[PDB]
Design a protein around this nucleic acid. Structure first.
Length: 247
RNA sequence: UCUUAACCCACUCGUCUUGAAACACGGACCAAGGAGUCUAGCAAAUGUGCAAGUGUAUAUGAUUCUUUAAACAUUUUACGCA
RNA sequence: CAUAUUUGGUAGGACCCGAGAGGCUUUGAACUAAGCGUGAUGAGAUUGAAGUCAGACGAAAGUCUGAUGGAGGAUCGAGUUGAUACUGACGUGCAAAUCGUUCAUUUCAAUCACGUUUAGGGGCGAAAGACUAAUCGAAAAGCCUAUUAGCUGGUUAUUUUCGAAAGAUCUCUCAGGAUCGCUGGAGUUGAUUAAUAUAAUUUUACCAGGUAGAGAUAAUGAUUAGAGGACAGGGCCUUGACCUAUUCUCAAACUCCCAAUAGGUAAAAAGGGCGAAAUAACUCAAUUUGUAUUUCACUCAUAUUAAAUAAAAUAACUCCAAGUGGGCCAUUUUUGGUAAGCAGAACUGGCGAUGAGGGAUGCUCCUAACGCUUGGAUAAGGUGCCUAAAUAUUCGCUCAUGAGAUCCC
RNA sequence: ACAUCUCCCUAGUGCAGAUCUUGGUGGAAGUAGCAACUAUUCAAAUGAGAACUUUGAAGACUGAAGUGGAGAAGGGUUUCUUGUCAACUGUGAUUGAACAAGAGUUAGCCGCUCCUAAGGGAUAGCUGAAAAGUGUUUAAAGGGGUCCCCGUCUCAAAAGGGAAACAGGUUGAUAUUCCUGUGCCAAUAGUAUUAUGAGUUAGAUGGUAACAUAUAUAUAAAUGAACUCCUUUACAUAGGCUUUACACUCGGGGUGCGUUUUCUUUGCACUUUACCUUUAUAACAAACCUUGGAAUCAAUUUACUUGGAGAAGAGGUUCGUUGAACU
RNA sequence: GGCUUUGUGCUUUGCUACUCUUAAUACUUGUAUGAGCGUACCAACAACCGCAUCAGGUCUCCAAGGUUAACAGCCUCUGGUUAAAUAGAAAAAAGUAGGUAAGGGAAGUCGGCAAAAUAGAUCCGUAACUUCGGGAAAAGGAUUGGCUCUGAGGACAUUAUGUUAACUCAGAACUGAAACGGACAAGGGGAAUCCGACUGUUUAAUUAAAACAUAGCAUUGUGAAAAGCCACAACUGGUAUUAACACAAUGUGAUUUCUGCCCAGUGCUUUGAAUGUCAACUUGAUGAAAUUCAAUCAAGCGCAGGUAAACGGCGGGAGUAACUAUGACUCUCUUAAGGUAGCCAAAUGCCUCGUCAUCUAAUUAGUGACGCGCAUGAAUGGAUUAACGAGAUUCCCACUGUCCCUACUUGCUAUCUAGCGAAACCACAGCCAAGGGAACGGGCUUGGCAAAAUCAGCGGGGAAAGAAGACCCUGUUGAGCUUUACUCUAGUCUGGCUUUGUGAAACGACUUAAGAGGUGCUACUUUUAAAGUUGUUUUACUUAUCCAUUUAUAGGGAUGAAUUUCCCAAUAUGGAGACAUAGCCAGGUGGGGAGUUUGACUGGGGCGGUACAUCUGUUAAAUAUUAACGCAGAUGUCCAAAGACAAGCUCAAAGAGAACAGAAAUCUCUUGUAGACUAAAAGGGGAAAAGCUUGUUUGAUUUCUAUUUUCAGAACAAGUAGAAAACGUGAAAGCGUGGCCUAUCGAUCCUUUAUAUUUGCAAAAUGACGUAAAUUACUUACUACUGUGCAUAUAGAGGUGUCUGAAAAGUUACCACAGGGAUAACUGGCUUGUGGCUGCCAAGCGCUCCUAGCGACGUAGCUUUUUGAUCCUUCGAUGUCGGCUCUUCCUAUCAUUGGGACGCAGAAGUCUCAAAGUGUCGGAUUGUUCACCCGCUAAUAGGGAACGUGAGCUGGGUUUAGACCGUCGUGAGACAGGUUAG
């Protein structure tokens, strides 16, 4: 045989992401003592788009505190954010859309986004278009806080971890019908060599293991172990159940 | 000697092949080069020397020091095989 | 024992040449692939989406209609890029894919450059096992390497001598190998005394047979008929079976009997006779009862002979080694198959490896096997001419509007 | 230079053959052939010799997506002059991109050169026997100010970014480069003289406004440090509209040339004008400002746009095009 | 601020054209202005790449007039050129690029291929059908020149009048060989089916599509640095400048419409205080130690569920409706469920050219139907579709030299000349007929015959050339691909041990006591101790460790700017954590990856068989030998008796008797040569027995030869004759070393247990200071039989049936190589079964009548016009079907001529002879020989020529590689199955 397309994708050659016109890493401002012990006020100067991200970025101007003069940060936009908005970040921040507050100090049933995966990690969860998380409960001792991810997952995280009030911008993005192949080409043009995928069954058996056979059978089970070999694991990995969910 | 004659005879050589003149294969022609060897270890044969022994091994010696890179010698009682 | 040379075995390139491969380390993205970065480039027409304005009709709700407008992986399309078809031209080219004509593509999933990335079981692949420098179902370079080969081809002066096998047995064995056979050399033995050993032979003794043959009334398996009789079926008669004498045909897988041919044993001196004596741990009452052995005798044909016949020692015997292990043809016997120049045998002889003469001709039929020559007389075979010998002799037969002419043919 | 048969050791020792190896050579045969791309002719010159050298006269073709100008890659003296004809120039040949001899490429202003990108190579480290694999990832390493502040390095575009030149002439062959003229650009240390404008008894003014002002040979300087904050550099595609330039055309006058029997108040050529001078002004699409106070909506573009967050109107001002327009 | 100075760069006193700023100049300070490289020419029309002055390839910009929509095509000015590896002369064939054709109009051919028709504008007109957007340039029409006019469309300035510019439109006359998009560019159209929705992409040089991509539908995994998935040797990366509207992995493939059933099997996945099995370690027990044993809470598999838009799949019967029929309805076996919506002789129906319509003149074609469907069917997607197509296919119109049926013509070649000038190829060569021969000869033999030198053509032959046939077969040569072939192995999962520290709690097991249940001072079963010993599960701490973070920028509680609400007020930080992780062991998973195997015989190979080890009879040719996928068979055992010996008896059958066996396994007498019986298997042998019955028994023993069978005269195996022992039986000789005889089976290495007064474990020893003496001791003798464990030697047994003994599956139409006519598919050849053709006979038929015509039941030939049988020829290549074209030969005569016979009235017509002189057609359908129709006809005969005819063509079919559907195959793939493209 010859090493397959999915194995080749991890090589890091042409499959290094098309990050050229992307405008920098979009992760939130770092946690610090100034947010922790107080609040920092900023001004939204601009809303800007990025081809790799599904979410608008927001240009926020903050003032240096250990030095003179004005410093600009790049924040992920929230739906209803606007140019000339005042944005507040910190423990002593008021509750309002696009403010950055520790999740422990959120009312239950709030909708929030840009959640740190663990404390101080800069909005690493809940960041795709139209996404949001909900605060669903607070521990009695106040150490942990219980949140709901848009997958449906429930999770208990530290109270001091930050998040950004409201839902991510550009909601409904995947709900416009894609007209044509040209639209798909442009979407992947700014992403990576992940498209077109090309059917594994169509290939010669030299490549993908769904390949071979004139009459186009798969000819062996397509539900595959979590422990399967890298050149064999093209199937439906570790599937709890398959078929249409009729009832 | 060469040269035609005429009488009688005379089918492409090599080849693998039961069987090749073959409708089997190689060969346009000529020249030069071009293929059972050398070493190791074993065997019988025959020659040759010695004999219940045999083979001087490694090595030492010399008026050995164009030849001499072998030839010569074995202390003024190793080893192989039988 | 040493040594010289040889041949054979065996390791090596091992007689010389011949693969597809397998491994190691490097090198290529100027072609080509996909991506990236920076740039360029795409005559001209056609259609005419939304939005906009206007008009008409409509009691109304509303409806139409005309402009504007300039949308679209929209339309036609030079070009650019390709390359559908003419299975066009070309097909020892202009060319290792050209040329002509046709056709598709042209503002986008567009085309082109330049720069850039990923390298060999590796890349890259809108996927064809595609592409990766005329190279790809595993590149190119060099090395391991003179890889390996029961398989193919080739394998060099002369004369002379002896001269085969194509059966067998075992073999992951049927294109091979090994070991037997058959071959050559080398030696020894004993042969020279017209005989003894000896002999693909007969003689006389002596055997072994169940094939050819022959049989059904001998048995076995068959198998056609009537006749003569003392239980049965049918309707005391008929039909049967059954008995008895008969009767027809049978087998190479049946045998009462039974060949020819082919085959075995036999024909005396290292032995045999008839005797005595010895020896024993066998035997037997019986250490001479037998046995066997031994020592002594006496004596068996043989001047040629223990029946013939034999260029019967050119025999034996031992060694070392070779080639060969696919066979094929004929008569007679013969199995399978409709048959076969088919498949498979038996005995012998050939051919193969071997030819001269005949069979017109011809690998195998017939005659006959060969140093070089001269002469002779023949063989097979012929004798009108081709074509050497008789238009011979002698008795028959034969006329053919497709006569007929010699084994294998 | 050659033999040894008198004897004997030794050998890479005897060829017809391997689609043998290498080299030469025939028959095939003066044959296959010298078949894309419209066409050449006449006379002359040269020279020993001319269908295919040169000149002239005809006829024609390429037909501005050119057999035309310029350039890149790549080639590398092929250029060019003078000779020249052994081989080559698949026919001829005096021809030639062939051969021999020489000559020829000149830059402050044109490129590279400078910068970063997609990228490559290293440092810091860390792995790996080493070879190498990586690239801030446990850093006591480069720069700027007056002890502080920044802070991995380096190569990578001859079509991205980027400081500055044009016109006419000239040689056998180069020219934005030589030459002549006009200019432009980056610089241009220290101290001392001098002139130029400012300010003084330490830092100008105008304009309600948007904003303007140093015209000295020369539009030169309009207080300013640390530390900051901005902006140019600097960007897709499509469609129309509009402005200029170059190009193209028509008509008049002026010069010369052409047709001209007949007809033609005719056909043709020429009628040229650069950068540079904060180019000076004018012009115009926009932007901005004062006044003004709009519905009965108005102003208004091919297109729809705009307006109490102030339109029309009225009066200005600026930017940008342009580049002697217009007193 | 400038000038001056004390005091302490600083400060007080005193003074006031000064302080800035450009440019020029002088003087000093290394020499105080201009770095370095490139710059020719070509850019293909000869300079670049293509081995080369190669019609190929090779990047960018500049862009004139007329015509016109136009930078197209066409001609022209500026600029360029008139050279292309030759010239001349002739003008036929033949070639090639072209033209043109009467009458017909696809009737030729697989195919309308080719060619032509069509095409521009303006004006009209435009359907089925549709997702209402299209279809659409639909279809179908008309017009178009030239000339002379008419009408419409601006700009300026005088108050309705002037001056003045571009051009485009519309209308009317006249005019002409009715001609005008006058060259030029430029669509053929319609009716339908099938497939794919679409734009897109692709086999560089035989492949543009029905394949791929695609939007849409759907699935799976994954919440994050201890995540998914993938890459790396290692450290580490990539996805990731990421974040579930995501990332990754897949499947189906527009719209419209639906997508049934089934979890057994194989997968994937989930639960587990009931659970079977399952390793290293550890723990315990045992032994003197080595050892040997137990025991334990791994994953895993198994059990039990979930899962079919996971892989996939979708039977058989019965019983049953007032006729026959079918069987809704009921029951059933099997299996997991047994084909639902639909759908069809379709690119899918073997049979098949299925049946019915219709289309035609004739329909293996087309279409619509039908549908017990060899073998349709529901995301393996079924059904339907407008738009769309260099798609596959049928038909109709238009058009036509495709064709009837060819003819004429132009260019360029050919041709000839001058000059130049190759190559492939070549045993030797070159006339035939027949024979034989390697069964097809250019040379051979016998015949025909046979006369130079040439010039032009052509493809009959040279089994012409290419090049160690890619077919096929063979190789203990390969390679690619696949699996539940064998053997591994990266990855991965899981356990143990270490790195790896510090504490706490809870829980089980084990030991002893007391109660309860049961048994014979003693022992068993069960409940409670909480005491001891021991294992586990939860947790706190952080120093190991791991991660994150920032310019390491705040001790702790209450669309301006920020620089020289309130109190006390002048481990760098989080997170996880001794678990991770990493290391080392260990089990599992593991075609992802690796290496390798994939018999032989064989009337080709494969399938099939076993003739591969054996035994009988026969073939077998009267000793012996002897084979074939010869024939008739048999074998892999069974037997404490069916072995051994003795003794006794006589069987099968027949008749006659006895209420039961005449007639489910009996009783008696008589007759009874074996007709019974002897385990099986067939043949031999066997009657006071080798049969049957009975008694007593175990020799079915230990040791050893000579040997025989097969045979090399080796083995093994099977035998024979004995011998040394000990016995058994009869006891009496005797007989017994398995089976009445011919058949009933296995080396070495390895394993295992027997056996020994025999041995070894390498400097020594292990019974034993045994037995004696001696004892001032390191005493001295004398002893036949001496540790665990391992090793032997000998003897059996465990097994090799591909049977003188490899640890071994598939596949290649993607393939490579070595060989092969030792071996298939092709001609030829032998043979001629089979096919085809002719006979003879005489029972019948033929009204009567064997024979006018026939001819059964039989029997004899001929042929190679069928197919076999075959494997002699050719495998370092004889080009594998059909058609066309074109010629020749045969006769077995279909017609035509002359006749004979007749069941011949005439007319027809039939059988037939001499006869090959002469002829033997147009089409429909087919890939097709063949076939099957329709029509004409004089009849539309049959055959040969290497299955006549590929350097004659054609390339439609079979038969390379792409692709499609069905069946079959887990799979790769297969399919003398269909289909499209080559």
């Amino acid at each position: 045989g010859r090493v397959i397309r999915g194995q080749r994708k991890g090589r890091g050659s042409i499959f290094k992401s098309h990050n050229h016109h992307r405008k920098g890493a979009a992760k939130l401002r770092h946690l610090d003592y100034c947010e922790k012990k107080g609040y920092i006020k900023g001004l939204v100067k601009d809303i800007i788009h990025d081809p790799g991200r599904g979410a608008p970025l927001a240009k926020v101007i903050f003032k240096r505190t250990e030095k003179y003069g004005k410093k600009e940060e790049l924040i992920i936009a929230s739906e209803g954010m606007f140019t000339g908005q005042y944005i507040s970040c910190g423990t002593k921040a008021p509750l309002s859309v696009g403010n950055i507050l520790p999740i422990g100090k959120m009312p239950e049933g709030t909708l929030i986004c840009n959640l740190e995966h663990r404390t101080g990690n800069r909005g690493t969860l809940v960041k795709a278009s139209g996404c949001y998380a909900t605060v669903v409960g607070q521990s009695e001792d106040g150490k942990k806080t219980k949140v709901r991810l848009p997958s449906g997952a429930k999770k208990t995280i530290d109270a001091k971890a930050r998040a950004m009030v409201g839902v991510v911008g550009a909601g409904g993005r995947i709900d416009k019908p894609i007209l044509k192949a040209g639209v798909a080409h442009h979407k992947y043009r700014v992403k990576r060599n992940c498209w077109p995928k090309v059917r594994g069954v169509a290939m010669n058996p030299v490549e993908h293991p769904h390949g071979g056979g004139n009459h186009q059978h798969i000819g062996h089970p397509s539900t595959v172990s979590r422990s399967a070999p890298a050149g064999q694991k093209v199937g439906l990995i570790a599937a709890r159940r398959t078929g249409l969910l009729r009832g």
